[PDB]
């Protein structure tokens, strides 16, 4: 829910990297749980233990991606002394993409994920800076 | 969000309030009406072609009825559209007149007093 | 190397590959009401908490 | 300017009411008359534009483009009637209808006073072109070529639509005169950077910019001859026209957002010129030539100087004429031997001398021999780039040498040597083909005689 | 049948010179082809090309090149005689410009 | 005998008629933008003893 | 089935929809939905076969669940405010359940699985009815409560509908399933602009209904339900294939065709709010619908597929039944963009 | 969407049952008749947005 | 050529003036309409964005078999 989002976003950028990584790991784990729930519903795994294995695999993948993204993003922000710079989010996104590539054992997936997650995270940082709204409230 | 659904004095299924009679009707040579007649003529041609009839010559009464019907509907459509736009402008002007604080007319400045930054192209 | 392979690889071939994979993922359902009614239950529960608990 | 629009709309029922054996004659005669009428648009002013109404206006940048469109229609008609002889009457009329609709959309695009109307027409030009390519092409690659042509264009053009409606909600107008008079600088923020990209990428993909040009060889090779003519001569210039129009509101952000596109244009100019040196298909060579020349035009528009704008206008007109002529020259040999491979039919100067003369003149204008308007545009752009930075001359210099090399390579491979022994079906050149080449080439030199008519509004 | 489909054979191409040794390449019908040649030549070379080039050559000077030249001659004459500078760096009179009060 | 000639070559008047109609419509469009006729600071002029409007 | 009984059932379907549209009481709206469903179930089984029976069963189960949730949301709203009038819906949980129930009725993603299946399992006339008339009541109810709607849920479901419609349509060779995925994407477009302007929702609904009617009537005219059976129509009626090609182009959203108008107006309306990212994604995604419309146009009109010998016998006979409104539907589907400012009469 | 046929023809198809303060049989009152009456009277004719505040 | 095919510069000059006036007024009107729509939807005190409320004429003002309603 938005409680996790607020827990992540309340901490300043280049401070307390361990807490930010923990919040990112929680967000990733929640996303992975939802993904595994939908996957099990639409694609039954033929065995309870197999369903547990698939849930654990998806959840661990997502949690690891989130943890890596948060850790490297915060570390870069505090090392460069440059908060509010999208390049930190780009680095975190590429690190998460390379984590996904290592997790699926595929070089092409790793490279594509690095590029796309880095670009998406940088875009999210730009949106936070400039006030871009994904779901604008009706104004007129 | 519905802007005009509940405007006071609106009659539910009227399509043409009596207030609309105070506006000049569209001219019968209005280019929009001519385009509606063109749409009716195209419908007649397509009707001829689908039924495997000579496209241009098959039914002149049918083509005339098509053009006439499209023009007839378009006239009232244009009247209603113009009425709605007149209503919108009337409401806009009344609201601006009744809320002077939200629409201030500030002092005019000539270009000889406004400092604009110059960006060279080189 | 560039015009026939990599410029092709990055923009149009990647787009085609991704769209085809997602089309295969989305469109390949067995048509069993059990599975996607379970999906409906998951959606309903998520919806109350994710968007409904926050008003 | 309804005195030009209405006669084309009348070309439509004139074609659909003609006898089965007079469609080409009627279409050609009335297309030529419409071109003569459009010739009156060249009487332009020195300070403002001709403001015909609230909807249409004519500048010194769009008048030569309109004249080029109206002049290109009859040439396409003459070039098409050879290979469409076995077609039924209804399908021939539909082909002519597609060409007429394309001309009408192009004529309205170059004179629209608002940016949204310009967008709607510049996007409506897609349907006739796609239909022509995918219906009257020869090989099975035409379907893929149509898909590439469609989606490359739309993926660039839709963000432009979003940006345009946003700009109208912000400033209250999209009318070009109001936009010009009430111009305000763009700050340096991520929102403004993405607005710049949305306003620029559609025109970039139309040119097309190097790395975004893969659709062009497919579409220009797989199309019929009239499709290739109008794709190379007019439809590529939509990007340049739109970019010179839209750059009015992009300052001072362009001062640094132009760097990646400038580097892409110069290096990809070198690359496409080099690609022309090893090409087995004669039409793909002409397509890559178009890419190189358009890269030069992109550079000129991006550096934003009066000399660069003059050079861009002149180069666009000259390239349209030259590339259309080259495509027709290649189509003659294709119709003779039914193959596009360049080294199949050789020594053609022995068999067709006058066609060899036409080949020589076309390839001389391709390499920008002075004092052709090709060279006038190229030299203006080179001078503007040199003022921008003295190191561009090296890249520009390399391009000039390479262009000459591949142009004369094409000429020597096709015309000189010894004729292939097994090919015995090379009939003499028809009067129609010679008239087509003459009507391509004579206006080029006539325009050289009076070059201020193609130098744009910055003159 | 060891075939896949019923199809017409690919036909040989027709030579317009066979039935018309002077064929002009416009149509198979000699009369229509001759008149197509005639209308193309007359309306392309005789009408649009030559007459249009003459019209463009004799277009009136709406670009105001000669007017500008004469105006500049008048201005140079007046400024040279009076001892005034030929040209001024500022194109706008500073009396109508109001700079900001403070620069500190 | 002109019946067949007319029925074979009546498609030759569509384009000139469209041209003259476009000229007429352009004149009509110009007729609706005279709000500043003889009113600009650069071209404001006293009327001649006979003429009514400075341009049409 | 007796023609009199069929006409009575059709009028009962329309009576339920009109009762939904004219009522002021939540109970009467629920009754209208019940009556509409009760009359609609037999129309889906008019041509009896196992596939039609399966389609009817799936439709009944989905719609009965949706109406149960609808009634529960009404009762919760009554509990927290003793109001039966259809208004701003004073309770948020009730509004969430109401939104989910109406989305289930419309077939918006995540609850979009039933639409391809029911459309493929019934006849083309039943599909025409299901994909045109059955959208009116839930959309009208959504329009009447648009102020209390939560944008985050509605916009999420709309974007999911556009994405899933495009992706699912990419994979189909059956024409009814293609139509169903197209319907899903257009429903997404309709519901994306609902919290901002209901006039745009109505305009998009009308244009979509016109294009869908034209497409279904063209498909009924040339009795094709698969891509390969539609590939034969050129050798029997080429005019039908040409008109279908132009209508398919219009459905794609290419200017200057009428299909482009709703997307254009919705993008403008969303940029009148802040809302920049969402229209950009929506257009980029509608490119997928354009892709599979273009593939259908390639297969049926722009190339000629091989035919069979027995088509010669069909050449000798004409179409007996004639659809009187098909030419007007085609013209309205294609050549209506210049009349865009007439949408002001919709509000 | 909503076609106010009842308002146009003056029919009262279902408005009689919408609120608790509207003409019950034998004049039996709702438990919260006065509160609903006051809320309705206070919010009548000012529109939904103004009324909520 | 000038006498036969073209007019003087003043015609184009003043037509441009008229066009510019019309377009500027339209732009100002568009901006003003957007602002008015924003204010009306925010405050709900204008003719636009009026949402239905229960009719007061539905209330029965009769003795209710109990003195306290
Ligand atoms: C940034 C913050 C968070 C962002 C959230 C949004 C992003 C979502 C990302 C998730 C992507 C899901 C789809 C891609 C995966 C592909 C499917 C798959 O199983 O392959 C797995 C693949 C390997 O498995 P595989 O077995 O090899 O797959 C081969 C088969 O072909 C694959 O199996 P298959 O082909 O046989 O099919 C399996 C099945 C599986 O079906 C699915 O997976 C369903 C997809 C839904 C996932 C979306 C949930 C996210 C919601 C987040 C909400 C907030 C959370 C807090 O697919 C289908 O059936 C498709 C049918 C389509 C029906 C759609 C119904 C879904 C409902 C709509 C979406 C959700 C609605 C929510 C509420 C709606 C109310 C209006 O790789 C993985 O394991 C990855 C799994 C999860 C990774 C997610 C990454 C998360 C990163 C977070 C970092 C945090 C950063 C810090 C924040 C600050
Ligand atoms: C006001 C609005 C709200 C309304 C809603 C609220 C309602 C609340 C009231 C609830 C009161 C209960 C009333 C009874 C309901 C009727 C149930 C029923 O009839 O069962 C039919 C259904 C099918 O009947 P059947 O055909 O006779 O039996 C077929 C065999 O059972 C299976 O045959 P098979 O061996 O061939 O299949 C393999 C096996 C394999 O099964 C599996 O693979 C499941 C293993 C998943 C691992 C669990 C995750 C572990 C960690 C997650 C912990 C989350 C928090 C912690 C965070 C991380 C910690 C580090 O089963 C399946 O694949 C079928 C799918 C069943 C999965 C459960 C579906 C629920 C949603 C999907 C969850 C997916 C899990 C992913 C993670 C999601 C969060 C937990 O039976 C079942 O599916 C299992 C029995 C369920 C009964 C108890 C569960 C009720 C849950 C109610 C709500 C909670
Ligand atoms: C418009 C004009 C034109 C533009 C468009 C055209 C040009 C751009 C597109 C074309 C090139 C882009 C392609 C990217 C790589 C594609 C990978 C791929 O296709 O995977 C599927 C494909 C399928 O593989 P699979 O099915 O998963 O398994 C079978 C494997 O093949 C079996 O694998 P294996 O057993 O043979 O060994 C694989 C192993 C070992 O590979 C080998 O066996 C041989 C050793 C090769 C490794 C090279 C690393 C050491 C040399 C680097 C020296 C310096 C770099 C140059 C810069 C100099 C600066 C002055 O590689 C690794 O373990 C990877 C670990 C990471 C080390 C390499 C990555 C370095 C990142 C570059 C940093 C650049 C930052 C910016 C710098 C700015 C200053 C200029 O993967 C491969 O087979 C290729 C493996 C190697 C890929 C990494 C090479 C990196 C190339 C440079 C990337 C820069 C471009 C992207 C920049 C944007 C990103 C944010
Ligand atoms: C923007 C500015 C204004 C433009 C407006 C928009 C465009 C024009 C209006 C569009 C609608 C009007 C026509 C609708 C009915 C056409 C249906 C048809 O089949 O026509 C055949 C029909 C020939 O049939 P027939 O004469 O009975 O005997 C021959 C057999 O039927 C032999 O027939 P068959 O069936 O055996 O032949 C088979 C053939 C049959 O297939 C077709 O004929 C295709 C026709 C489809 C109709 C178009 C769809 C609906 C309209 C949407 C247009 C969208 C335009 C926007 C841009 C997008 C481009 C698509 O199929 C094929 O060969 C397959 C070829 C594949 C090519 C795919 C391209 C098709 C789409 C192209 C549409 C372009 C616009 C219309 C083109 C003109 C059509 C006549 O054509 C005509 O003769 C009628 C056309 C001329 C009527 C207007 C003349 C007015 C009177 C003259 C005086 C003018 C007054 C001036 C006032 C001043 C005083 C002097
Ligand atoms: C194949 C051909 C395709 C067509 C080519 C299109 C060209 C697009 C390139 C865009 C040009 C510039 C875009 C943004 C302008 C500056 C870029 C940035 O790197 O510069 C620095 C930006 O700093 C860092 O680089 C932050 C950006 C890092 C994240 C961006 C991701 C780049 C990774 C490469 C992905 C490939 C993109 C293209 C996809 C195909 C400047 O520092 P800063 O002053 O702080 O930012 C200026 C903006 N301010 C003033 C509002 C603050
Ligand atoms: C086959 C055998 C060939 C060889 C034999 C040939 C024999 C000799 C004939 C060759 C002529 C030699 C050329 C020498 C130049 C003399 C002509 C020149 O003096 O005229 C120019 C005039 O040339 C014209 O201005 C240029 C022609 C315009 C070209 C437009 C082309 C027509 C439209 C066709 C379609 C358009 C397609 C392209 C779209 C943009 C001068 O311009 P200008 O300095 O002012 O005149 C000053 C006096 N004025 C102003 C009062 C008139
Ligand atoms: C987030 C969502 C973004 C959606 C972006 C979609 C871009 C629109 C293009 C969609 C292309 C879909 C093609 C596809 O998926 O199928 C692969 C297809 C399979 O062929 P079929 O015709 O389906 O099968 C016939 C024989 N069985 O493979 C192909 O060969 C495709 C050929 C044409 C592809 C052309 C695509 C060119 C794209 C240019 C770049 C722009 C892409 C769009 C995004 C731009 C980036 C912002
Ligand atoms: C086939 C190749 C063609 C590819 C072309 C695609 C690239 C197009 C460029 C990006 C288009 C999206 C821009 C959106 C339109 C701009 C309008 C605008 O100005 O909006 C900005 C907001 O700008 C944005 O939101 C844009 C964010 C981007 C969202 C979508 C990302 C698309 C992909 C990004 C990277 C790709 C772009 C470059 C690609 C180069 C070509 C390959 C102002 O909004 P406000 O909120 O009011 O500002 C102040 C108040 N906060």
Q: Give the span between the Cα atoms of G231 and G296, in whole angstroms.
A: 9
Contacts of F3 (CB under 8 A, 6+ apart): none
DSSP-derived letter for residue D112 is B
End-to-end CA gap in chain A: 29
**Nearest Cα to G102, choosing from D99, B71, D46, C47?**
C47
Q: Which of G270, G273, G277 comes nearest A132 by C-beta?
A: G277
Which of G24, G26, G83, G87 has the highest number of chain I CBs within 10 A, making it the mutation to test binding with I?
G87
Q: Which residue's C-alpha comes closest to atom 29 of ligand 5?
A: A87
Q: Give the span between the Cα atoms of D43 and I16, in whole angstroms.
A: 17
Residue of chain B minimizing CA distance to E99: B113
D414 phi and psi angles, rounded to 5 deg: -85, -35
In this structure, are residues B3 and I48 in contact, taking their beta carbons and an 8 Å threshold? yes
If residue B20 lies in a helix (H) or strand (E), which one and from where to where? none
Nearest ligand to the C-alpha atom of residue D124: 4
End-to-end CA gap in chain H: 27
Q: Give the span between the Cα atoms of G40 and G45, in whole angstroms.
A: 9
- Domain boundaries defined on chain F: 1-56
Q: Give the span between the Cα atoms of A68 and A82, in whole angstroms.
A: 19
What's the CA-to-centroid distance between G271 and ligand 1, angstroms?
30
Last residue before each break in chain G (C–N > 2.5 Å) = none
- Ligand 5 interacting residues, C-beta cut-off 6 A: A 85-87, 90, 119, 122; D 188-190, 193, 211-212, 257, 260
**Nearest Cα to G291, choosing from D391, D368, D117, C15?**
C15
In this structure, are residues D162 and D142 in contact, taking their beta carbons and an 8 Å threshold? no
Q: Which residue's C-alpha comes closest to atom 16 of ligand 5?
A: D257
In this structure, are residues G319 and G203 in contact, taking their beta carbons and an 8 Å threshold? no
**Nearest Cα to H43, choosing from G334, I51, G49?**
I51
- Ligand 6 interacting residues, C-beta cut-off 6 A: D 39, 64, 67-68, 71, 317, 443, 446-447, 449-450, 454; E 48-49, 52-53, 56-58
Residue C48, classed as helix, strand or coil, is helix
Q: Give the span between the Cα atoms of H51 and D193, in whole angstroms.
A: 44
What residues are paired with D50 via a beta bridge?
D58
Nearest ligand to the C-alpha atom of residue D193: 5
If residue I41 lies in a helix (H) or strand (E), which one and from where to where? helix I9-43
Please report, for residues D146, H38, I61, the alpha-carbon distance to residue H29 in angstroms, rounded to integers and kept in the order given: 74, 15, 11
Q: Which atom of ligand 2 is nearest to the CA of A44?
A: 63
Contact across the interface for D10 and F17, Cβ inside 8 Å: yes
Q: Give the span between the Cα atoms of A103 and A56, in whole angstroms.
A: 13
Q: Give the span between the Cα atoms of D306 and D303, in whole angstroms.
A: 10
Contacts of G1 (CB under 8 A, 6+ apart): G42, G46
Residue of chain A minimizing CA distance to G281: A134
Helices (H) and strands (E) in chain G, counts: 16, 0
Residue G65, classed as helix, strand or coil, is helix
Q: Give the span between the Cα atoms of D265 and D209, in whole angstroms.
A: 7
Contact across the interface for A41 and C53, Cβ inside 8 Å: no
**Nearest Cα to G278, choosing from G289, G288, G267, G287?**
G267
Q: Which residue's C-alpha comes closest to atom 10 of ligand 3?
A: C6
Contact across the interface for B112 and E100, Cβ inside 8 Å: no
- Would you state the torsion angle of the CA atoms of residues D166, D168, D169, D172, taken in this order, to the nearest 10 degrees? 160
Q: Give the span between the Cα atoms of B49 and B61, in whole angstroms.
A: 16
In this structure, are residues G70 and G98 in contact, taking their beta carbons and an 8 Å threshold? yes
Q: Which of I32, I41, I48 comes nearest B96 by C-beta?
A: I32
What's the CA-to-centroid distance between D194 and ligand 8, angstroms?
4
Q: Give the span between the Cα atoms of B78 and B61, in whole angstroms.
A: 26
Pocket test for ligand 8, best of A126, A128, A132, A140 (most atoms within 8 A of CB): A132
Q: Around Cβ A110, how many Cβ atoms within 10 Å? A: 19
Q: Which residue's C-alpha comes closest to atom 37 of ligand 6?
A: D68
Q: Around Cβ A26, how many Cβ atoms within 10 Å? A: 18
Q: Which two tokens stand for residue D193?
A: 């950077």
For residue B107, give how far its alpha carbon lies from the nearest alpha carbon of chain E (Å): 16
D58 phi and psi angles, rounded to 5 deg: -125, 125
The stretches of chain B forming alpha helices (DSSP H) are 31-50, 60-98
Q: Give the span between the Cα atoms of G144 and G138, in whole angstroms.
A: 10
Q: Give the span between the Cα atoms of D293 and D384, in whole angstroms.
A: 16
Residue located via tokens 């201030």: B104
Contact across the interface for G327 and B43, Cβ inside 8 Å: yes
Q: Which atom of ligand 5 is nearest to the CA of C11?
A: 1
Q: Which residue's C-alpha comes closest to atom 17 of ligand 5?
A: D257
Q: Give the span between the Cα atoms of D137 and A93, in whole angstroms.
A: 45
What residues are paired with A31 via a beta bridge?
none
Q: Which of D6, D26, D54 comes nearest F19 by C-beta?
A: D6
Chain D residues lying within 8 Å of B119, measured CB to CB: 185, 251-252, 255
Cα dihedral across residues G153, G157, G160, G162: positive or negative? negative
Beta strand segments in D7-56, E: 50-51
End-to-end CA gap in chain G: 41
Q: Which two tokens stand for residue F36?
A: 């500043």
If residue H39 lies in a helix (H) or strand (E), which one and from where to where? helix H33-43
Chain I residues lying within 8 Å of D175, measured CB to CB: 23, 27
What's the CA-to-centroid distance between G194 and ligand 3, angstroms?
47
Chain E residues lying within 8 Å of D452, measured CB to CB: 63
G297 phi and psi angles, rounded to 5 deg: -65, -40
Q: Which two tokens stand for residue B12?
A: 């539910």
For residue H33, give how far its alpha carbon lies from the nearest alpha carbon of chain G (Å): 11
Does H have 3 or more CB contacts under 8 Å with F?
no
Buried b (16+ CB within 10 A) or exposed e, G139-165: bbbbbbbbbbbbbebbbbbbbbbbbbb
> What is the greatest pairwise CA distance in chain G?
71
Q: Around Cβ G313, how many Cβ atoms within 10 Å? A: 8
If residue D279 lies in a helix (H) or strand (E), which one and from where to where? none
Question: Which residues 24-83 on chain D approach chain I with CB closer than 8 angstroms?
Answer: 40, 43, 45, 48, 50-51, 53-54
Residue G265, classed as helix, strand or coil, is helix
D371 phi and psi angles, rounded to 5 deg: -100, 45
CA G149 to chain CA centroid, nearest Å: 22
Helices (H) and strands (E) in chain D, counts: 21, 2
Q: Give the span between the Cα atoms of G319 and H35, in whole angstroms.
A: 68
Contact across the interface for G171 and C23, Cβ inside 8 Å: yes
Q: Subunits touching G (CB < 8 Å, at least 3 pairs)?
A: A, B, C, D, H, I
Q: Give the span between the Cα atoms of H21 and H33, in whole angstroms.
A: 6
Q: Which two tokens stand for residue D202?
A: 């559609």
**Nearest Cα to G347, choosing from B88, I42, B9, A138?**
B88
Please report, for residues D4, D407, I46, the alpha-carbon distance to residue H49 in angstroms, rounded to integers and kept in the order given: 54, 73, 10
Pocket test for ligand 6, best of D450, D455, D459 (most atoms within 8 A of CB): D450
Q: Give the span between the Cα atoms of D41 and D57, in whole angstroms.
A: 11
For residue G309, give how far its alpha carbon lies from the nearest alpha carbon of chain H (Å): 52
A-G CB pairs within 8 A amount to 33
Quick check: bond before G256 cis, omega within 30? yes
Q: Give the span between the Cα atoms of G21 and B60, in whole angstroms.
A: 40
- Would you state the torsion angle of the CA atoms of residues A67, A70, A73, A75, taken in this order, to the nearest 10 degrees? -80
Q: Which residue's C-alpha comes closest to atom 26 of ligand 4?
A: B55
**Nearest Cα to G190, choosing from G144, G139, G249, G252?**
G139
Contacts of G42 (CB under 8 A, 6+ apart): G1, G9
**Nearest Cα to H16, choosing from G84, D385, D454, G247?**
G84
Q: Give the span between the Cα atoms of D94 and G242, in whole angstroms.
A: 11
In this structure, are residues D375 and D296 in contact, taking their beta carbons and an 8 Å threshold? no
Label each residue of A22-71 as H, E or C: HHHHHHHHHHHHHHHHHHHHHCCCCCHHHHHHHHHHHHHHHHHHHHHHHH
- Domain boundaries defined on chain B: 1-99
């Amino acid at each position: 829910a938005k409680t996790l989002l607020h827990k992540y976003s309340d901490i300043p950028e280049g401070t307390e990297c361990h807490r930010k990584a923990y919040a990112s790991t929680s967000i990733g784990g929640a996303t992975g749980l939802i993904v595994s729930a939908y996957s099990i519903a639409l694609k039954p795994p033929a065995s309870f233990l197999e369903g547990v294995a698939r849930t654990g695999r998806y959840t661990f993948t997502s949690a690891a991606i989130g943890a890596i993204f948060g850790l490297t993003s915060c570390i870069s922000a505090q090392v460069r002394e440059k908060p509010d710079d999208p390049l930190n989010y780009f680095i975190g996104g590429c690190a998460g993409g390379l984590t996904l590539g290592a997790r699926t054992r595929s070089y092409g997936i790793g490279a594509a994920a690095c590029a796309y997650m880095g670009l998406t995270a940088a875009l999210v940082k730009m949106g936070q800076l400039e006030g871009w709204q994904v779901f604008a409230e009706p104004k007129v | 969000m519905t802007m005009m659904s509940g405007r006071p004095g609106r009659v539910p299924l009227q399509f043409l309030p009596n207030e609309a009679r105070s506006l000049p009707p569209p001219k019968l040579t209005d280019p929009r009406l001519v385009y509606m007649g063109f749409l009716g003529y195209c419908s007649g041609l397509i009707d001829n072609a689908i039924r495997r009839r000579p496209v241009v010559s098959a039914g002149l009464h049918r083509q005339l009825l098509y053009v006439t019907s499209f023009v007839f509907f378009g006239y009232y459509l244009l009247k209603r559209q113009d009425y709605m736009y007149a209503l919108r402008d009337h409401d806009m002007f009344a609201y601006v007149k009744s809320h002077p604080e939200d629409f201030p007319e500030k002092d005019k400045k000539t270009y000889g007093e406004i400092l604009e930054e110059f960006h060279p192209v080189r | 190397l560039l015009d026939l392979i990599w410029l092709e690889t990055i923009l149009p071939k990647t787009t085609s590959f991704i769209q085809m994979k997602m089309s295969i993922m989305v469109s390949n359902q067995k048509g069993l009401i059990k599975l996607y009614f379970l999906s409906f239950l998951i959606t309903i529960m998520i919806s109350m908490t994710l968007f409904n608990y926050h008003e | 300017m309804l005195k030009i629009i209405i006669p084309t709309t009348m070309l439509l029922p004139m074609t659909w009411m003609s006898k089965h054996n007079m469609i080409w004659i009627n279409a050609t005669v009335h297309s030529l008359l419409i071109s003569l009428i459009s010739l009156s648009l060249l009487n332009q002013l020195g300070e403002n534009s001709l403001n015909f109404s609230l909807t249409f206006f004519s500048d010194s940048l769009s008048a030569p483009l309109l004249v080029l469109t109206t002049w290109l229609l009859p040439l396409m008609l003459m070039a098409s009637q050879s290979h469409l002889s076995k077609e039924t009457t209804t399908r021939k009329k539909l082909y002519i209808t597609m060409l007429i609709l394309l001309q009408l959309f192009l004529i309205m695009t170059f004179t629209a006073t608002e940016l949204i109307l310009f967008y709607i027409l510049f996007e409506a030009t897609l349907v006739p072109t796609l239909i022509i390519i995918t219906r009257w092409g020869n090989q099975t690659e035409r379907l893929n070529a149509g898909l590439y042509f469609l989606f490359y264009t739309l993926a660039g053009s839709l963000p432009l639509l979003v940006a345009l409606v946003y700009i109208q909600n912000t400033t209250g107008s999209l009318n070009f005169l109001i936009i010009h008079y009430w111009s305000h600088p763009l700050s340096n923020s991520w929102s403004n950077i993405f607005m710049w990209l949305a306003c620029i990428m559609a025109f970039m993909v139309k040119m097309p910019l190097y790395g975004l040009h893969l659709w062009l060889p497919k579409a220009h090779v797989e199309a019929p001859i009239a499709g290739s003519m109008v794709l190379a001569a007019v439809l590529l210039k939509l990007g340049g026209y739109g970019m010179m129009r839209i750059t009015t509101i992009l300052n001072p952000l362009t001062n640094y957002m132009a760097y990646p596109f400038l580097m892409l244009s110069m290096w990809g100019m070198i690359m496409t010129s080099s690609i022309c040196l090893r090409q087995t298909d004669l039409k793909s060579l002409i397509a890559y030539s178009s890419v190189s020349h358009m890269a030069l035009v992109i550079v000129a528009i991006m550096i934003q100087t009066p000399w660069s704008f003059m050079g861009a206008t002149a180069l666009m007109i000259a390239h349209g004429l030259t590339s259309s002529m080259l495509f027709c020259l290649a189509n003659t040999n294709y119709e003779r031997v039914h193959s596009r491979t360049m080294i199949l039919a050789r020594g053609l100067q022995t068999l067709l001398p006058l066609m060899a003369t036409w080949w020589l003149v076309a390839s001389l204008t391709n390499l920008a021999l002075p004092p052709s308007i090709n060279l006038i545009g190229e030299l203006f752009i080179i001078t503007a780039s040199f003022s921008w930075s003295n190191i561009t001359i090296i890249l520009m210099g390399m391009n000039m040498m390479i262009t000459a090399l591949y142009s004369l390579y094409m000429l020597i491979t096709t015309q000189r040597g010894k004729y292939t022994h097994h090919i015995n079906n090379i009939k003499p050149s028809f009067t129609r083909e010679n008239a087509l080449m003459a009507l391509h080439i004579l206006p080029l030199l006539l325009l050289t005689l009076n070059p201020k008519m193609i130098l744009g509004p910055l003159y | 049948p060891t075939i896949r489909l019923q199809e017409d054979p690919d036909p040989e191409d027709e030579n317009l010179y066979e039935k018309n040794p002077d064929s002009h390449g416009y149509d198979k019908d000699p009369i229509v082809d001759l008149w197509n040649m005639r209308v193309v030549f007359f309306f392309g070379f005789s009408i649009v090309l030559v007459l249009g080039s003459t019209f463009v050559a004799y277009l009136p000077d709406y670009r105001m090149q000669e007017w500008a030249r004469r105006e500049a001659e008048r201005l140079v004459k007046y400024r040279e005689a009076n001892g005034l500078p030929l040209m001024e760096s500022n194109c706008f009179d500073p009396n109508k410009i109001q700079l900001p009060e403070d620069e500190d | 005998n002109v019946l067949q000639i007319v029925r074979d070559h009546w498609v030759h008047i569509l384009v000139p008629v469209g041209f003259v109609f476009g000229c007429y419509l352009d004149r009509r469009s110009d007729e609706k933008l005279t709000a500043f006729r003889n009113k600009s600071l650069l071209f404001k002029r006293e009327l001649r003893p006979n003429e009514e409007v400075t341009w049409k | 089935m007796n023609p009199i009984i069929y006409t009575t059932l059709i009028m009962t379907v329309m009576s339920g929809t009109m009762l939904v549209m004219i009522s002021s009481h939540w109970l009467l709206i629920w009754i209208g939905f019940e009556m509409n469903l009760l009359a609609m179930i037999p129309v889906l089984m008019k041509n009896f076969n196992p596939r039609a029976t399966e389609a009817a069963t799936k439709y009944f189960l989905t719609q009965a669940t949706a109406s149960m949730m609808l009634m529960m949301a009404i009762i919760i709203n009554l509990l927290y405010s003793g109001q039966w009038t259809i208004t701003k819906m004073f309770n948020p949980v009730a509004m969430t359940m109401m939104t989910m129930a109406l989305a289930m009725k419309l077939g918006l993603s995540p609850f979009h699985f039933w639409v391809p299946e029911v459309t493929q399992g019934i006849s083309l006339q039943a599909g025409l009815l299901l994909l045109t008339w059955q959208k009116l009541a839930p959309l009208s109810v959504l329009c009447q409560i648009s102020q209390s709607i939560n944008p985050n849920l509605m916009l999420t479901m709309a974007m999911l509908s556009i994405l899933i419609g495009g992706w699912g349509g990419l994979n189909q060779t059956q024409l009814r399933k293609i139509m169903a995925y197209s319907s899903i994407a257009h429903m997404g477009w309709m519901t994306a602009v609902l919290p901002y302007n209901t006039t745009m929702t109505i305009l998009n609904l009308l244009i979509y209904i016109t294009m869908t009617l034209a497409m279904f009537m063209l498909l009924i005219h040339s009795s094709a339900t698969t891509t390969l059976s539609l590939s034969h129509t050129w050798n029997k009626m080429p005019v039908i294939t040409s008109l279908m090609m132009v209508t398919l182009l219009s459905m794609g959203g290419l200017p200057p065709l009428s299909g482009f108008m709703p997307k254009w107006m919705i993008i403008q309306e969303m940029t009148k709010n802040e809302s920049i990212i969402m229209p950009t994604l929506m257009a980029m995604t509608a490119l997928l619908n354009l892709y599979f419309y273009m593939r259908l146009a390639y297969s049926s009109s722009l190339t000629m597929f091989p035919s069979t010998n027995n088509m010669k016998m069909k050449w000798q006979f004409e179409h007996t039944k004639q659809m009187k409104l098909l030419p007007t539907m085609i013209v309205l589907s294609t050549l209506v963009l210049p009349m865009t400012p007439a949408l002001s009469s919709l509000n | 969407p909503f076609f106010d046929v009842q308002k146009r023809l003056g029919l009262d198809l279902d408005r009689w049952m919408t609120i608790q303060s509207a003409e019950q049989p034998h004049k039996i009152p709702g438990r919260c008749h006065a509160f609903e009456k006051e809320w309705i009277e206070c919010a009548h004719g000012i529109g939904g947005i103004r009324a909520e505040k | 050529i000038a006498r036969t095919f073209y007019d003087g510069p003043e015609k184009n000059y003043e037509k441009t003036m008229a066009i510019l006036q019309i377009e500027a007024e339209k732009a100002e009107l568009r901006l003003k309409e957007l602002e008015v729509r924003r204010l009306m939807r925010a405050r709900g005190d204008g003719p636009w964005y009026q949402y239905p409320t229960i009719d007061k004429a539905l209330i029965d003002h009769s003795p209710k078999t109990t003195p306290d309603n």
